[PDB]
């Protein structure tokens, strides 16, 4: 029996949902439940993005599936084919080419690498130089889709191929949205009006009695699941706040990405959220129509670096440089503290729009020896060892993997008491303090208190380690194990 | 070594060129030289049209060739209807007054199917529709059973591109179209051949590629549909020998031998004469004209386009029955034959004129017959495929045309012993008529001389008998065996010179 985690794709830079899905996959393998990520969009680069995270046997993409290119890995010279075997002439432009048959312009080629061992696309031209067809190659090397062009380079139809070149899907467009999909599957032909219907057909082919689906990218996956039979069990996963305005719990509309789910609640066996605090809110809002269960979206890995080698007082913030994170407040906090703590430092690890504003605010206060915008760091392990405490000054949060990591490194945290995440991970006077939202005077008081009393910081450090031990991998595994078993048990 | 007779296709009703190519194939087969008809146009009925006349191994069609369907015959019958209902679970709604079906998946309209036969055994096409009932694709089926071509539509069912498949469904050719003067015109052709891709701008270049794939040293090509085949051969190397075959007068204006432009259909051949090893024409008379016109730059040879079978049927069982075997078209001037009977009936009222053929002029000829009171004397017999019983009591054939070509019909009536009086017009009458031997040649449009000569033969049955015997003897010069000998000698000499 398989557990399927249904998102949409994998970007160059993984998103929160994409990381959550791969993480949940790893957890399931570890505990001995089979699991696979399920992807939907056509993405001829998907194998390239999966590479550093997940193996090809750990995912099924919908187009791969019908193109008979699932579980397929990279193929092992185009320029030697076009010259030595085909006798064409190539005039470089980029990593591009014009392919001529003697004097005749035939094709425009585009590669990725300067080794020109990975073909991207090839445009075809008629006798009047009209672009008639574009051939799109998969990073694994096979020809994946040819697009037929009309009028002012408008998409008329597209043909999708298996690696041997057989046509497996056809799409027909009017102005450009799909009006028709043809699929060659199981030795016959299937017809669909749109990609949502194609999605539901895919889900029905995947399912065998006993499997469980999770709906993770709900703006795409809920409409698909809404067209599949109720005998196919699926759980909805919310990775963010469920309503547009968190202060109108009862009346706020559901977020657009969650509408199709919440408007068909009876289709879902349960809803998963990351925090008890969110579970209680969602339960109330939906009048307990279906179960809601809190399962953390990550766990505390075992520590492999030195911990709490203190000496400079190092404050840290691990947060995207975004408005909601209200990072200027921490710069203000440092402006106040530095007169009491001359060797204080604040390191802020993240990225986003607020970079310029924040850096200029540092220049304005002369705090360039005290506050550092560190940018994004892949590995933060070395940064926590001398970290005295973490700061959260956000107006809104989600379950923080970063917070769990720093708590695992013994770094206590002072945070505003906003939904969702801090209440889950912080018990005041245990592993840190929760501060009234936007109360910057109380923030200053607690931060200064922990700095003034290193024995308080040490004790809050021991609480941090204990808080992290509560969210261990094994505790997380056991929550998922019992959830899946109980969901399936009730379905059948 | 193979001889290839390159025409375009075969219709349900064979044209003169198509007949000439099949006749030539049968002579080469009897002779023992390998021969094959070569066809160019995409025609998914071609196997059906060919079945009455040649075998599958007797021809190579260009599209069949690249579709890996050359020499393929008819598949076992397939009941698409049971496939669509029992296996696919579709709903089939018959269209009344048709062999058609609308095909549904529940409430969703998917497909419109057209069958050739009312037994629904020959699927012809299936149209596909999108969610807005737009017709986006047409699947065209070969009569042999396989899906031959899918046509992609745009806008108001205009042809954008076409994909051609082998019988297993692999794409072997692609064609892209742009419109001109309201019609689709090829702008690009892609061909999957020899594990490669080949690119062309038009059907002439594809044809030229196809000729090059067929040729091996020793082979010989005949260009029979020169409006298409000469532009093809002009794109092939002079190492490939080709003979141009003319099937009609070579110039627009027969009365300006030296200076008339060539007919449009022959223009590409005559403008590249050095490409061709020889020209074949049907009559000695045309040979002399063409030789003179091209200043003997390449050999010109006359070989008749068909042959005569000796007749076992009753012959000349002689009412005075005049006959005309002629399409009802203005060039034949059949109204003059009405005028002849109008004059003649006074002198023998037992006369009859039977006119075998069809065409636009039939109304006008009926009017004249009624006008002259000739309804019991002149008959428009329509088309008759077999004429053999009609020849047995025929006194005399008439030709009043202002232009002609070599006539297999006249050859057949001479084999049945029917003598002939004809205007002396090019081409054909001088080939098949020797004055006072099997008939008479009359100055063109001299109706009075026509009257006098016809009356003379009616008045002298012993002359009719003499001319009838000359007709038998004349026809026997065009025997199967004489034609074979001509073809054998020609091919021998052409190959020797080329090599």
């Amino acid at each position: 029996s398989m557990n399927y985690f249904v998102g949409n794709s994998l970007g160059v830079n993984l998103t929160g949902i994409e990381k959550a899905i791969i993480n949940r996959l790893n957890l399931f393998k570890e505990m001995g439940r089979p699991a696979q990520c399920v992807f939907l969009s056509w993405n001829r680069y998907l194998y390239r993005n999966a590479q550093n995270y997940i193996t090809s046997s750990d995912y099924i993409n919908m187009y791969d599936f019908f193109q008979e290119a699932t579980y397929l890995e990279r193929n092992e010279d185009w320029l030697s084919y076009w010259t030595d075997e085909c006798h064409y002439t190539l005039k470089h432009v980029s990593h591009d080419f014009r392919i001529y048959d003697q004097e005749r312009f035939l094709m425009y080629a585009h590669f990725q690498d300067p080794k020109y061992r990975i073909l991207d696309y090839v445009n075809h031209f008629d006798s009047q130089r009209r672009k008639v067809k574009r051939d799109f190659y998969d990073v694994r090397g096979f020809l994946s889709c040819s697009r037929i062009l009309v009028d002012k380079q408008q998409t008329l139809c597209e043909f999708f191929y298996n690696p041997e070149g057989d046509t497996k899907l056809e799409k027909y467009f009017s102005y450009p949205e799909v009006q028709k999909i043809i699929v060659y599957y199981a030795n016959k032909q299937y017809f669909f009006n749109n990609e949502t219907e194609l999605g539901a057909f895919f889900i029905k082919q995947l399912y065998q009695h006993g499997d469980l689906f999770f709906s993770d990218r709900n703006v795409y996956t809920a409409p698909i699941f809404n067209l599949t039979p109720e005998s196919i069990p699926v759980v909805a996963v919310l990775h963010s706040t469920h309503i547009k305005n968190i202060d109108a719990l009862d009346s706020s509309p559901f977020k657009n990405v969650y509408k199709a789910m919440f408007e068909n609640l009876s289709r879902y066996r349960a809803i998963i959220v990351s925090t008890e605090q969110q579970k209680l809110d969602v339960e109330k809002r939906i009048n307990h129509t279906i179960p809601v269960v809190n399962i953390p979206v990550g766990y505390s890995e075992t520590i492999d670096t030195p911990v709490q080698t203190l000496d400079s007082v190092k404050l840290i913030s691990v947060a995207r440089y975004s408005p909601e994170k209200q990072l200027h407040q921490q710069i203000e906090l440092i402006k106040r503290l530095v007169s009491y703590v001359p060797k204080i430092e604040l390191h802020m690890y993240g990225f986003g729009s607020e970079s310029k504003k924040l850096n200029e605010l540092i220049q304005k206060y002369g705090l360039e020896n005290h506050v550092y915008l560190r940018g994004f760091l892949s590995n933060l392990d070395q940064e926590y060892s001398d970290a005295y405490l973490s700061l959260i000054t956000s107006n809104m949060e989600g379950f923080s993997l970063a917070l769990l990591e720093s708590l695992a490194h013994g770094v206590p945290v002072i945070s505003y008491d906003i939904k969702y995440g801090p209440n889950e991970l912080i018990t005041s006077d245990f592993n840190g303090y929760l501060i009234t939202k936007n109360d910057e005077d109380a923030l200053f008081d607690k931060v200064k208190y922990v700095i003034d009393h290193p024995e308080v910081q040490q004790r809050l450090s021991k609480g941090s380690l204990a808080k992290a031990q509560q969210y261990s991998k094994a505790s997380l595994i056991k929550q998922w194990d019992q959830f899946v078993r109980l969901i399936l048990e009730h379905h059948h």
Side-chain angles (χ1 to χ4, degrees), chain A:
Chain A
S1 266
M2 183 58 63
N3 297 281
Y4 293 114
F5 311 146
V6 191
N8 185 47
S9 205
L10 292 176
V12 199
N13 303 311
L14 295 201
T15 81
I17 296 174
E18 303 176 348
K19 278 168 289 192
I21 272 158
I22 289 152
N23 285 338
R24 186 188 317 132
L25 166 77
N26 295 336
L27 282 182
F28 270 58
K29 300 135 70 74
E30 271 203 21
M31 90 175 92
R33 277 201 191 270
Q36 282 182 305
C37 292
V38 177
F39 297 113
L40 297 182
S41 57
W42 176 69
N43 189 353
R44 60 196 214 262
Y45 305 108
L46 182 40
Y47 187 85
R48 179 209 73 181
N49 305 357
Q51 198 98 46
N52 296 326
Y53 295 128
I54 168 181
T55 71
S56 45
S57 76
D58 286 331
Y59 73 83
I60 309 178
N61 167 274
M62 191 189 37
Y63 287 83
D64 277 352
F65 180 78
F66 292 120
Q67 294 179 259
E68 303 169 352
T70 76
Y71 309 141
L72 201 74
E73 317 239 19
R74 276 170 184 282
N75 300 1
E76 7 267 298
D77 192 4
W78 279 106
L79 299 200
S80 161
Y81 186 66
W82 288 337
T83 53
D84 314 349
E85 283 305 288
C86 288
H87 310 131
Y88 301 157
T89 296
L90 312 78
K91 141 190 298 285
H92 156 260
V93 170
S94 324
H95 284 160
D96 294 359
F97 279 138
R98 298 201 127 111
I99 310 96
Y100 288 83
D101 170 22
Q102 300 207 117
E103 69 282 13
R104 301 187 156 204
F105 178 51
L106 291 179
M107 281 163 275
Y108 189 116
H110 171 18
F111 291 77
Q112 295 261 95
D113 48 330
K115 286 177 73 65
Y116 304 98
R117 321 208 162 197
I118 302 178
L119 191 59
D120 197 76
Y121 82 61
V122 181
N123 294 353
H124 290 276
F125 297 91
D126 74 0
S127 63
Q128 300 294 90
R129 291 281 289 310
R130 305 185 245 250
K131 193 152 38 178
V132 294
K133 184 165 75 163
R134 319 192 43 207
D135 291 353
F136 297 111
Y137 286 79
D138 191 280
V139 156
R140 294 166 284 172
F142 65 82
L143 176 58
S144 190
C145 170
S146 299
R147 178 179 296 157
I148 308 310
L149 287 67
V150 303
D151 296 332
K152 304 281 179 202
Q153 300 189 69
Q154 301 222 288
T155 289
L156 174 67
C157 65
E158 300 165 327
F159 301 116
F160 298 77
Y161 307 111
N162 62 17
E164 308 88 287
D166 308 334
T167 301
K168 298 319 276 215
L169 303 94
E170 300 183 19
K171 312 223 304 209
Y172 296 83
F173 301 83
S174 290
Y175 275 72
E177 43 212 68
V178 186
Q179 307 297 336
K180 184 177 192 76
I181 305 172
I182 304 176
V183 181
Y184 305 93
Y185 180 74
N187 304 94
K188 54 222 172 223
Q189 273 165 69
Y190 297 88
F191 298 100
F192 308 97
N193 283 351
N194 54 59
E195 283 191 63
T196 306
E197 286 173 8
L198 175 58
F201 183 75
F202 175 49
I203 294 305
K204 293 185 222 160
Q205 301 320 304
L206 281 186
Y207 179 72
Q208 318 193 238
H209 181 268
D211 296 340
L212 181 58
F213 284 92
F214 297 75
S215 181
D216 274 299
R217 189 68 168 106
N218 284 283
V219 69
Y220 298 139
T221 60
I224 288 169
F225 279 107
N226 290 352
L227 302 172
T228 59
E230 288 212 353
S231 62
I232 301 175
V234 57
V235 168
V237 188
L238 290 51
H239 298 272
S240 73
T241 295
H242 55 289
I243 43 169
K244 291 181 204 217
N245 164 46
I246 192 56
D247 310 300
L249 291 176
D250 296 20
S251 65
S252 179
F254 296 110
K255 285 199 187 143
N256 287 349
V257 293
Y258 297 141
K259 271 204 164 66
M261 197 276 300
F262 276 104
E263 284 167 8
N264 200 18
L265 277 165
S266 66
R267 178 60 192 100
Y268 300 96
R269 304 311 296 180
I271 299 180
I272 290 166
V273 298
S274 65
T275 67
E276 190 176 45
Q277 193 176 34
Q278 175 153 43
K279 175 195 106 97
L280 294 169
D281 291 343
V282 175
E283 265 174 345
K284 180 185 180 57
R285 176 57 181 267
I286 71 158
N287 315 305
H288 306 70
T289 305
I290 68 176
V292 186
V293 177
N294 62 301
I295 305 182
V297 81
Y299 69 96
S300 45
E301 305 155 70
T302 68
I303 305 308
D304 185 17
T305 36
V307 167
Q308 293 291 290
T309 44
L310 313 175
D311 212 4
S312 175
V313 176
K314 181 178 179 189
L315 305 196
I316 69 172
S317 158
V318 184
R320 291 57 55 61
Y321 299 172
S322 67
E324 51 156 344
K325 263 37 178 170
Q326 310 184 120
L327 292 186
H328 60 278
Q329 286 191 22
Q330 302 184 24
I331 292 182
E332 295 285 341
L333 169 63
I334 294 295
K335 191 228 161 60
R336 221 177 146 180
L337 275 168
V338 71
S339 49
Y340 304 76
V341 186
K343 269 301 176 302
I344 193 168
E345 305 184 356
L346 169 58
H347 299 244
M348 310 184 76
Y349 309 84
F351 69 91
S353 51
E354 302 304 7
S355 298
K356 43 153 186 151
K357 251 166 281 153
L358 283 176
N359 210 276
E360 286 177 339
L361 186 56
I362 298 165
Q363 288 162 27
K364 179 149 148 279
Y365 294 146
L367 295 174
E368 44 275 347
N369 291 325
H370 295 94
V371 185
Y372 302 103
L373 303 173
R374 293 294 301 281
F376 185 81
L377 279 63
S378 270
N379 170 29
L380 282 172
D381 283 337
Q382 291 195 324
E383 294 291 336
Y384 296 128
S385 67
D386 55 357
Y388 196 79
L389 65 84
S390 296
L391 297 176
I392 300 171
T393 54
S394 309
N395 55 55
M396 182 180 240
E397 278 291 321
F399 192 100
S400 184
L401 285 195
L403 184 45
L404 194 54
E405 196 173 75
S406 60
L407 290 175
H409 284 86
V411 186
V413 53
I414 295 165
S415 175
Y416 287 150
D417 190 346
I418 78 284
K419 287 164 191 212
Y420 297 111
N423 216 47
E424 188 72 23
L425 288 184
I426 309 166
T427 303
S428 274
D429 212 21
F430 182 73
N431 65 312
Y433 296 105
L434 290 165
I435 304 299
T436 281
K437 177 200 181 183
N438 284 326
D439 197 347
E440 297 175 59
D441 286 338
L443 173 72
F444 172 85
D445 289 353
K446 283 304 182 187
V447 170
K448 181 162 162 55
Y449 176 76
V450 175
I451 292 172
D452 285 339
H453 301 100
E455 83 278 356
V456 173
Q457 188 281 341
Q458 285 159 12
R459 170 175 63 78
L460 299 176
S461 181
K462 303 315 190 176
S464 297
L465 292 176
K467 184 59 78 158
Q469 171 72 15
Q470 295 168 37
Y471 290 81
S472 72
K473 199 209 287 166
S475 81
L476 190 51
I477 276 163
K478 155 214 307 153
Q479 290 179 78
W480 276 117
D481 190 58
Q482 231 153 33
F483 177 78
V484 168
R485 179 169 56 71
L486 284 161
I487 277 299
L488 285 169
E489 162 200 305
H490 175 220
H491 186 63
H492 315 265

